[model samples]
Target: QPDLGLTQLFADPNLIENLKKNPKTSEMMKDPQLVAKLIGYKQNPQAIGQDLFTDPRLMTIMATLMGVDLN
Candidate 1:
């Protein structure tokens, strides 16, 4: 961390605080299922053999969690 200029990025709590305040991040931190499903989504886009992602619920929850407005 001696030469890490990026340390300034962390010196400001605003960034982490923003993420901490984000509903999606907060929800995932509190809910194991949401976090698990988000990880699953990252692992794969299709849902098992049914869709692109490994789980259908993944998309459902993510959309609702992030206000992504997939519609």
Candidate 2:
């Protein structure tokens, strides 16, 4: 089974550090409005149409956890 505590798994330390060096990134991080915009949650506040079945990896993991054969 995949680790459930996999927070910030796709984030790169180097890329974050590089972005920190820029004034724009720093400004955006400090501004509440810009921060909300950058996060993309403000545009789609509702979980109306999320595709849980689109990812094969997630489906396989869920199937394994439920003791079902994905095939």
Candidate 3:
């Protein structure tokens, strides 16, 4: 199973720094709104969970961030 939610995962400064360098997510990082959707969640996981699955791009970025093997 893949790791979910960024509420606690955002604690890692190194992870945040690495996201900026990750080529897969770098272009999308330019959009403040998308970045907000990626990290600006203060709601319930269940609520965000539903939303997350619908957006494959968000899922891709998160999966890449968490080092999940998509292959």
Give a tens-digit lDDT track for model 1, residues 1-71. Answer: 11211222323333333334533435444545654444444444433333324443333333433343333
lDDT rank order = 3, 1, 2
Whole-model alpha-carbon lDDT for candidate 3: 0.53
| Model 2 lowest lDDT segment of ten | 4-13
Candidate 3 per-residue lDDT, tens place, 1-71, comes to 76454444443344545556654555667765666555545233445556566665555556665665333
- 1 versus 2: better TM-score goes to: 1
Q: Give candidate 2's error at residue 3 in angstroms.
A: 20
Q: TM-score, each model? A: 0.26, 0.23, 0.50
Off by more than 4 A, model 1: 1-19, 46-71
lDDT of 2: 0.32
**Per-prediction RMSD in angstroms?**
13.3, 13.4, 4.3
User: Which segments of model 3 are wrong by more than 4 Å?
Assistant: 1-15, 42-46, 68-71
Itemize residue pairs with steric clashes in candidate 2.
Answer: none
- Residue 2 of model 1 has an lDDT of 18
lDDT of 1: 0.37
Which parts of model 2 have CA positions greater than 4 angstroms off?
1-49, 68-71
